[PDB]
Amino acid sequence: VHPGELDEYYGFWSGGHSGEVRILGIPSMRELMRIPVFNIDSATGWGITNESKRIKGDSAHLMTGDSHHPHMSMTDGSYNGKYVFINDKANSRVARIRCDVMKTDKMITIPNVQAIHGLRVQKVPYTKYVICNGEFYRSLFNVIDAEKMEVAFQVMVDGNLDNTDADYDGKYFFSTCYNSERDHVVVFSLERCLAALKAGKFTNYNGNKVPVLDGRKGSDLTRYIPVPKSPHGINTAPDGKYFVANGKLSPTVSVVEIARLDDVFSGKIQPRDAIVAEPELGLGPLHTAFDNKGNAFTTLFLDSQIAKWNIQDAIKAYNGEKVNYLRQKLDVHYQPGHNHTSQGETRDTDGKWLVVLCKFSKDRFLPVGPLRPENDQLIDISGDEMKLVHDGPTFAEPHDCMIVHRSKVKPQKLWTRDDPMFADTVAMAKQDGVTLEMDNKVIRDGNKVRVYMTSIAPNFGMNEFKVKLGDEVTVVVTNLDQVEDVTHGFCMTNHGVQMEVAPQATASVTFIANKPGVQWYYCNWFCHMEMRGRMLVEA
Amino acid sequence: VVHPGELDEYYGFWSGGHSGEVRILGIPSMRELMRIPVFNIDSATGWGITNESKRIKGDSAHLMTGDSHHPHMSMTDGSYNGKYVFINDKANSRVARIRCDVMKTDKMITIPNVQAIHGLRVQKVPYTKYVICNGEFSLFNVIDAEKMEVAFQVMVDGNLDNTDADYDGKYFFSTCYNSRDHVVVFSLERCLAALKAGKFTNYNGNKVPVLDGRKGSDLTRYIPVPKSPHGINTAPDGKYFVANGKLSPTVSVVEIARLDDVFSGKIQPRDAIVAEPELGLGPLHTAFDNKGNAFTTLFLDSQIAKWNIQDAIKAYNGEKVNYLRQKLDVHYQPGHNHTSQGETRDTDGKWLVVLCKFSKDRFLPVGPLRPENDQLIDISGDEMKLVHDGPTFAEPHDCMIVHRSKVKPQKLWTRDDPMFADTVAMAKQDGVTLEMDNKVIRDGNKVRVYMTSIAPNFGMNEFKVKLGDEVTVVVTNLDQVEDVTHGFCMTNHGVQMEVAPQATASVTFIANKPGVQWYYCNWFCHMEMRGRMLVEA
């Protein structure tokens, strides 16, 4: 990607422990934007603005989180560009990002659980539900309503749940049990789950209304396919025909044929009969991604490699044929966890790019101290041979990523005044008699002051206001510029308050006027230089 | 082109801008290798939340944000020594020191008498004894690099913008954006003289020495420069500085040798100037190669102008000569630019980096918030060539490029490190030896819990607290291999922290939440590292 040329895909990377989501240019691998979710963001005021606190809700007091599995919504198994879903492994939260504006717009705490592993989206007919694994010793599969951001129901299971995926028919979800020689993949029949809901075969644990179903062994709702051993990843192939459970402690992967699952649910066949391959690949197989020619790419954590293999040949070998299913092994640097192909989790898998997330970079970059970056490696798989083309230092241990063709995402260039994200601020303003598109007013409410001001580069609509020492001050800034990329900032000097105000947005922030005398506020973002003003704090 | 297996030639220290951090970049890759938290609350490392970082932030530990402005590395003597990086928080009147051995912020001060801080540079020669910055009361601040305390302040007329230093240790310089305006020149020798002679005032409840550098004073000389000048940049031969015209289409070149005679009264302030070349609309900032050329950002024109300094001197004295060598479009609205080792005697003329404020069409769209564009230009050959377009987050104001040989960080922490010394001292008063103990100490409604970690285990499986107890967790990573960072994460309490090999970190929270509460090693250290805090009603 020379200068002047554009990337072909957007990458949505997990921020890991940074609590953000990152947008990347694929194949350049350059970071284009950071979207704050679970962190406190100095740049935007996310965590500190009243709008962001409202979105955070009950968890607004949390300052950190571990951004885990980012997935984008689909319509019938292709990305639709609408939302990106992400979980906080550390605090039992799932967040939704709206891709028109690239900001987090909803966040929920999942009830009845102390941790959240694994998040994926329903593929087909479209993303109605988001699924993830919870724990409290025992496990709960969670089905969340994507558009409502509410928990629909949960299914209690035998075992401890790890990763999840979904099929390409809308009938089934599945998850790996990391603990119960064999472990299992639990398969969830959605039809049967929804039936059981209408019948009223459910419980609520104390202090909530989330309906909990019984999906333990011998339930109608679930079948347990045995698989070795403490498996990790579970990955659906882009033809809808198989899924792969990744051995981890065992040097294999088990391939299951989704068409057989009905027969397992009827008792027409036994759970083991779902499995149609068990190819030995190498030590520590964690995660499998797929191309468009029926090959798979599996990360070998202990071996530090990617194994390319062919799924039809593996099925043939499990039936005693002499065919080589392993195509190639490629060293990676070092300790690969997850890997993802370009549009890989969808029907549009194009077989161009494989990304590998390696946990230890070692000698691969300049030394920068005891805290070291991870390595994200870009692999050209478009040809017969896999080829390592780029090493991407990466911060705070991203767990997972997602790659979408640019044609499927179309962000806004400006906010719109009716956006739900600052609707409640607009509501508050209306209560005070204030029209945000034209007014610069100060409202006095007891020991509170709300200060409504507009900004048009190169100045604020209010030169100054006067408050008392001690007063709780709320500042509502509306950026009335109508030109793309003309972000304004509001910074109240020496109070540790700053926030971006994008074109057409309103933002607000609340602080105590603790310091007496003339305080300066200004436009911190390049919006000029006059954008300046004074808060006179009186003794 | 840095291929897989090849390493970058230089480290870049990039301003975090409004992110409040410093970024470490590989040059010429332009890959972000690390983020050093400074003025921000960092979720990944716990910086801003841990007791160690709160101690370093001091009187500003309540602030949750800032705008990290000018990163500059220490020198000996006109050459980077890799020891420290200094950086200011424009928004909150703070300066911070990063130790490059550990790549962490080790000191932070709030500067007195000042309501905001703009420029920051390091003394070059004989070594980085002082760090200099500009404050609005305006005040010139001289900070003791090593001690991180303000040595003295100098009151001037007009409003200070950017600053630089000479290559002899005699003179500091600053632009005034408000009162032709001026560049104030400060004589260090005469400033130190006046300190010793007691010719200084104090303010308020600080005892910071404040000297008079207003017009007419012995300490300062005001050189007139058009118009609301921005950048002030010292050429790498030490002979000139350039003040950047901004509103005026020019740069002014002052000859540093002439400044003694300006201070003596032998020549006039205006006689300092030896070239005023016209370059283009909006000249903001200049960088230098190692062949006599300068590279100036033209903001309104959106270009870089390469010109020659000696030819501009010749043209100023009537000669019929062409000083302007090339103009280059950049994309778009160039603010600052820096050359590889450019602000030192080691300037190598390999690479120019340009910070442009508007991406517009250069990257995939990503919403109403757009990245800025950091453009890498190859300046080795005759003409300048654009080789790379670097999206950057949150408006980086400034950067510096240092050769990798001059930086040499630690692989591990050491137990005596002053960054956890007071924790170590607190553990000692509790009778605790951090390299071996897993203990719980009870004190009123305080609880101190000391634990060790060796992958894949915490030394303490579980402990018991009452509801509402104030709990400090001190974790010591005892692995001895590089790159085996651990984390401590107490689930559902919004507490996480990195614990690098041999380091100690502590975090204090209230146990608000009854019942079993899991903590674990969030960072890949795995997978057993788990443990239970039992909170009892």
Side-chain angles (χ1 to χ4, degrees):
Chain A
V1 186
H2 287 90
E5 304 192 334
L6 288 171
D7 290 300
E8 192 81 25
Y9 313 75
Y10 293 93
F12 285 76
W13 249 246
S14 164
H17 312 286
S18 82
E20 76 201 348
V21 170
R22 285 159 211 175
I23 305 156
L24 268 71
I26 312 301
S28 69
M29 311 305 299
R30 301 166 292 185
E31 175 183 44
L32 304 174
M33 179 59 34
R34 290 187 208 165
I35 305 157
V37 194
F38 305 115
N39 57 304
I40 303 305
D41 193 67
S42 180
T44 64
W46 182 272
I48 291 147
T49 65
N50 296 314
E51 289 71 22
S52 63
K53 285 158 91 146
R54 167 169 296 269
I55 292 157
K56 284 171 99 121
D58 58 345
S59 71
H61 66 107
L62 309 184
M63 307 205 189
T64 66
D66 183 321
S67 150
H68 198 42
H69 280 113
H71 227 84
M72 178 175 280
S73 60
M74 318 181 202
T75 313
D76 72 345
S78 293
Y79 293 126
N80 64 36
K82 189 134 187 296
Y83 300 116
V84 182
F85 291 99
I86 186 88
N87 69 305
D88 182 356
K89 213 194 146 175
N91 313 278
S92 311
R93 302 186 281 183
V94 179
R96 191 178 74 192
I97 292 149
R98 260 172 57 203
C99 303
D100 54 355
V101 299
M102 300 297 194
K103 295 278 165 175
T104 298
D105 81 325
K106 301 288 181 193
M107 189 178 299
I108 62 183
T109 301
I110 287 60
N112 305 323
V113 308
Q114 309 171 245
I116 287 177
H117 304 268
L119 174 144
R120 253 172 280 188
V121 295
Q122 180 175 5
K123 298 173 152 40
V124 167
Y126 61 90
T127 302
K128 172 56 186 300
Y129 295 119
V130 173
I131 47 160
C132 60
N133 298 312
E135 321 218 318
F136 63 125
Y137 193 81
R138 232 198 241 169
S139 282
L140 297 181
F141 183 73
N142 296 259
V143 193
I144 299 166
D145 195 324
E147 303 149 358
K148 260 218 286 186
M149 288 290 288
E150 197 179 33
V151 172
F153 63 95
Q154 286 158 345
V155 178
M156 171 158 42
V157 307
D158 287 316
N160 296 118
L161 300 160
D162 187 354
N163 290 264
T164 51
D165 212 343
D167 72 356
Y168 281 91
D169 312 297
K171 310 160 63 170
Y172 304 113
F173 304 131
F174 11 87
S175 304
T176 40
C177 282
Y178 69 67
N179 194 34
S180 302
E181 175 54 22
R182 290 207 178 210
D183 273 311
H184 25 255
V185 164
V186 60
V187 181
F188 297 97
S189 165
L190 187 52
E191 279 277 34
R192 298 199 193 188
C193 282
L194 295 169
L197 274 171
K198 305 308 129 92
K201 307 204 205 282
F202 66 78
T203 308
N204 296 313
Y205 295 117
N206 206 45
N208 69 62
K209 288 225 134 57
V210 160
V212 189
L213 305 172
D214 196 2
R216 291 174 314 200
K217 289 222 183 62
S219 165
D220 200 51
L221 308 179
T222 43
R223 301 278 177 276
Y224 293 69
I225 306 184
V227 63
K229 172 217 182 146
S230 170
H232 184 65
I234 182 160
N235 304 284
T236 301
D239 58 21
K241 278 158 69 186
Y242 317 99
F243 72 69
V244 178
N246 296 98
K248 185 156 94 212
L249 302 185
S250 157
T252 63
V253 297
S254 327
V255 184
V256 169
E257 181 167 24
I258 292 150
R260 298 200 181 177
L261 297 167
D262 305 347
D263 292 319
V264 184
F265 270 89
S266 40
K268 169 153 168 176
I269 67 190
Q270 293 304 301
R272 276 288 279 267
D273 296 306
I275 293 158
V276 299
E278 222 142 39
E280 165 147 71
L281 295 157
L283 306 171
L286 281 175
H287 201 270
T288 297
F290 310 83
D291 77 359
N292 60 336
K293 304 139 205 226
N295 308 302
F297 300 92
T298 304
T299 54
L300 306 175
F301 180 80
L302 290 160
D303 277 2
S304 205
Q305 287 167 304
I306 303 309
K308 185 183 176 188
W309 52 288
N310 182 267
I311 298 156
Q312 281 314 317
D313 289 10
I315 289 158
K316 295 196 226 311
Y318 192 76
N319 291 286
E321 295 225 30
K322 295 307 167 218
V323 64
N324 184 10
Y325 57 73
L326 187 87
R327 289 282 179 282
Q328 192 185 356
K329 289 195 171 160
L330 189 64
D331 288 305
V332 291
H333 310 102
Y334 303 82
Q335 315 324 118
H338 285 209
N339 66 334
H340 301 93
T341 44
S342 39
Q343 331 193 245
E345 289 225 35
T346 69
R347 305 189 162 293
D348 304 305
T349 302
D350 66 359
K352 292 280 166 220
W353 302 112
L354 172 56
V355 170
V356 191
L357 312 197
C358 284
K359 302 271 160 299
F360 302 115
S361 56
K362 304 286 181 54
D363 59 303
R364 298 297 291 185
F365 307 120
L366 293 177
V368 288
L371 164 50
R372 209 172 218 176
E374 289 80 26
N375 186 8
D376 299 325
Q377 284 170 105
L378 187 70
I379 300 167
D380 179 358
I381 54 171
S382 73
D384 209 22
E385 186 137 322
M386 304 194 274
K387 289 179 171 171
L388 174 54
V389 316
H390 173 94
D391 277 15
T394 195
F395 180 59
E397 206 202 341
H399 311 290
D400 202 56
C401 78
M402 193 219 106
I403 301 160
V404 51
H405 193 257
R406 67 191 170 191
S407 62
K408 310 204 187 269
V409 196
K410 296 163 189 317
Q412 287 170 210
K413 296 171 185 90
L414 312 163
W415 292 81
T416 64
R417 295 300 312 158
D418 62 351
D419 201 276
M421 289 178 48
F422 42 80
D424 224 89
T425 300
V426 174
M428 180 187 56
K430 176 159 218 181
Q431 206 97 353
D432 290 328
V434 176
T435 301
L436 300 172
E437 287 75 9
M438 68 177 207
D439 288 339
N440 294 275
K441 287 168 190 180
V442 180
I443 307 292
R444 311 204 175 257
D445 175 356
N447 293 114
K448 288 134 91 184
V449 180
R450 303 183 275 282
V451 173
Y452 291 94
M453 77 167 79
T454 62
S455 51
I456 301 280
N459 229 301
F460 284 124
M462 198 181 286
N463 290 308
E464 50 164 73
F465 59 102
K466 196 182 173 211
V467 300
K468 320 260 181 133
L469 194 64
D471 279 355
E472 189 198 284
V473 174
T474 303
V475 173
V476 179
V477 171
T478 298
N479 176 349
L480 300 178
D481 275 300
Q482 300 192 128
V483 158
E484 73 191 337
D485 201 356
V486 174
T487 300
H488 295 173
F490 178 80
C491 184
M492 187 65 84
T493 279
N494 304 125
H495 292 70
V497 173
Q498 60 188 234
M499 46 178 204
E500 60 114 27
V501 197
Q504 298 306 128
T506 291
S508 80
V509 62
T510 299
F511 59 90
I512 298 174
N514 263 329
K515 305 191 78 220
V518 177
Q519 316 298 347
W520 288 89
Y521 54 80
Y522 70 98
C523 180
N524 49 311
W525 286 77
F526 214 80
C527 28
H528 94 305
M529 283 288 289
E530 303 128 72
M531 287 206 64
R532 186 180 246 252
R534 310 188 301 168
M535 175 176 66
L536 315 194
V537 187
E538 200 196 23
Chain B
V1 197
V2 190
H3 285 122
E6 178 77 325
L7 297 168
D8 286 296
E9 187 160 282
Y10 310 83
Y11 295 94
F13 289 80
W14 253 240
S15 173
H18 319 286
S19 69
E21 83 204 341
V22 172
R23 291 160 206 169
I24 299 169
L25 268 74
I27 312 279
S29 288
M30 316 296 276
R31 295 169 299 177
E32 186 180 324
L33 300 181
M34 183 52 42
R35 289 180 212 168
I36 297 170
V38 190
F39 301 117
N40 54 313
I41 297 303
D42 184 34
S43 170
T45 67
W47 180 268
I49 285 140
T50 64
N51 297 308
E52 289 76 17
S53 68
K54 275 147 148 248
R55 186 164 219 94
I56 289 147
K57 293 165 84 134
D59 43 305
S60 72
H62 69 115
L63 305 189
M64 288 189 283
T65 61
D67 183 71
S68 75
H69 209 60
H70 294 297
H72 217 40
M73 180 174 268
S74 50
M75 312 196 192
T76 303
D77 38 287
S79 190
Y80 290 122
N81 69 27
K83 191 164 173 215
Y84 301 112
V85 174
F86 299 90
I87 182 77
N88 60 305
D89 181 355
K90 188 175 149 166
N92 306 295
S93 308
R94 297 187 285 182
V95 179
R97 193 174 71 189
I98 292 148
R99 254 169 61 209
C100 301
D101 57 22
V102 293
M103 287 310 167
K104 295 278 183 184
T105 289
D106 78 332
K107 308 280 165 188
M108 188 177 303
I109 62 174
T110 309
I111 301 171
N113 308 326
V114 152
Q115 274 213 50
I117 288 296
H118 189 277
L120 171 156
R121 288 270 163 275
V122 296
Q123 177 169 11
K124 306 194 189 289
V125 168
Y127 60 99
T128 300
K129 168 69 195 299
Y130 294 116
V131 190
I132 53 168
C133 70
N134 294 134
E136 316 228 306
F137 173 60
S138 67
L139 285 178
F140 180 77
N141 300 276
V142 188
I143 299 173
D144 192 290
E146 287 163 352
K147 300 213 309 191
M148 289 283 298
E149 84 162 16
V150 174
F152 60 98
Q153 299 170 324
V154 179
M155 181 145 233
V156 305
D157 286 325
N159 297 121
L160 298 166
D161 199 335
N162 300 258
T163 56
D164 214 350
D166 70 359
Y167 281 87
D168 313 300
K170 296 147 72 175
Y171 297 122
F172 301 134
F173 325 132
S174 316
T175 47
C176 297
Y177 71 69
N178 192 329
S179 297
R180 288 209 174 221
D181 271 307
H182 41 255
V183 163
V184 187
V185 181
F186 306 87
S187 175
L188 184 53
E189 186 172 43
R190 296 181 172 197
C191 285
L192 300 162
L195 277 184
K196 264 162 177 93
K199 314 220 196 214
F200 64 79
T201 185
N202 273 353
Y203 286 111
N204 298 113
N206 64 75
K207 295 187 190 70
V208 166
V210 177
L211 303 173
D212 202 314
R214 298 190 292 99
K215 275 210 219 59
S217 163
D218 209 51
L219 306 177
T220 44
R221 289 285 173 276
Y222 295 71
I223 302 189
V225 168
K227 167 175 76 189
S228 182
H230 189 67
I232 184 149
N233 308 116
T234 298
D237 62 19
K239 286 186 76 197
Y240 312 100
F241 75 73
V242 177
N244 300 105
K246 190 163 91 199
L247 302 194
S248 167
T250 52
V251 290
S252 307
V253 192
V254 163
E255 192 190 302
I256 293 157
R258 301 182 175 206
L259 303 181
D260 286 355
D261 286 343
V262 177
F263 271 86
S264 86
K266 175 154 161 188
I267 66 184
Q268 303 313 283
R270 192 79 151 75
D271 303 309
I273 290 152
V274 298
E276 249 167 15
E278 180 147 64
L279 293 159
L281 293 168
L284 277 177
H285 194 277
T286 295
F288 302 90
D289 69 4
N290 65 325
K291 314 162 80 68
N293 304 302
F295 295 97
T296 309
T297 58
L298 305 167
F299 183 76
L300 300 181
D301 283 339
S302 197
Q303 286 155 310
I304 300 314
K306 188 183 174 206
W307 50 286
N308 184 264
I309 300 157
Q310 292 307 310
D311 285 353
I313 291 167
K314 296 197 215 313
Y316 192 68
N317 282 284
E319 198 154 339
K320 300 294 76 154
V321 72
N322 201 177
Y323 58 79
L324 188 49
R325 294 291 188 279
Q326 192 181 347
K327 280 173 154 179
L328 191 73
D329 290 309
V330 295
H331 313 286
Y332 300 89
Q333 270 56 68
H336 275 215
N337 56 351
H338 302 86
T339 28
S340 38
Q341 325 209 244
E343 257 173 297
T344 64
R345 301 304 298 272
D346 294 278
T347 301
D348 59 9
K350 298 287 162 203
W351 306 107
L352 179 70
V353 169
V354 184
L355 315 188
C356 287
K357 307 285 143 180
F358 302 114
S359 305
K360 292 176 199 167
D361 58 302
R362 300 296 284 184
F363 305 125
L364 291 178
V366 289
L369 175 59
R370 299 286 160 115
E372 284 77 32
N373 189 15
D374 291 2
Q375 299 183 260
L376 184 62
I377 288 95
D378 172 342
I379 53 172
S380 296
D382 288 294
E383 80 275 58
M384 313 180 269
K385 294 180 181 187
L386 173 56
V387 295
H388 179 99
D389 266 1
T392 41
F393 181 66
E395 205 188 323
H397 309 295
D398 186 32
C399 69
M400 49 142 301
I401 301 155
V402 56
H403 192 270
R404 68 174 152 180
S405 67
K406 297 174 198 293
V407 192
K408 311 183 155 278
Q410 292 178 202
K411 298 166 200 97
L412 309 171
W413 291 79
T414 63
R415 296 300 304 149
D416 61 333
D417 193 286
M419 292 184 66
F420 36 87
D422 323 57
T423 302
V424 171
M426 174 187 71
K428 220 159 80 72
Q429 299 322 88
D430 279 347
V432 173
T433 304
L434 294 175
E435 296 77 4
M436 46 181 273
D437 298 35
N438 290 264
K439 288 175 174 168
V440 185
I441 307 295
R442 305 211 191 256
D443 180 23
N445 290 112
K446 315 263 151 42
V447 175
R448 288 178 299 277
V449 175
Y450 296 92
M451 71 176 79
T452 52
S453 67
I454 300 211
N457 305 74
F458 281 133
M460 182 184 301
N461 293 322
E462 59 130 285
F463 60 102
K464 298 184 186 191
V465 295
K466 306 191 250 75
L467 183 81
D469 280 15
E470 185 188 310
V471 179
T472 311
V473 177
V474 185
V475 183
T476 297
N477 176 342
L478 299 172
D479 279 288
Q480 300 184 115
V481 175
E482 69 193 343
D483 207 5
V484 179
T485 287
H486 302 169
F488 177 71
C489 175
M490 183 66 86
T491 63
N492 309 114
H493 291 77
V495 165
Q496 52 194 54
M497 57 186 191
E498 77 145 343
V499 199
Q502 303 304 128
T504 292
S506 61
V507 58
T508 297
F509 55 92
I510 309 309
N512 279 322
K513 307 186 58 156
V516 172
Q517 307 292 324
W518 293 86
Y519 52 88
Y520 69 110
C521 184
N522 48 331
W523 277 87
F524 203 92
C525 27
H526 265 164
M527 314 129 278
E528 306 195 311
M529 252 147 154
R530 217 195 269 84
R532 304 188 312 157
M533 184 181 67
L534 319 182
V535 192
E536 219 309 312

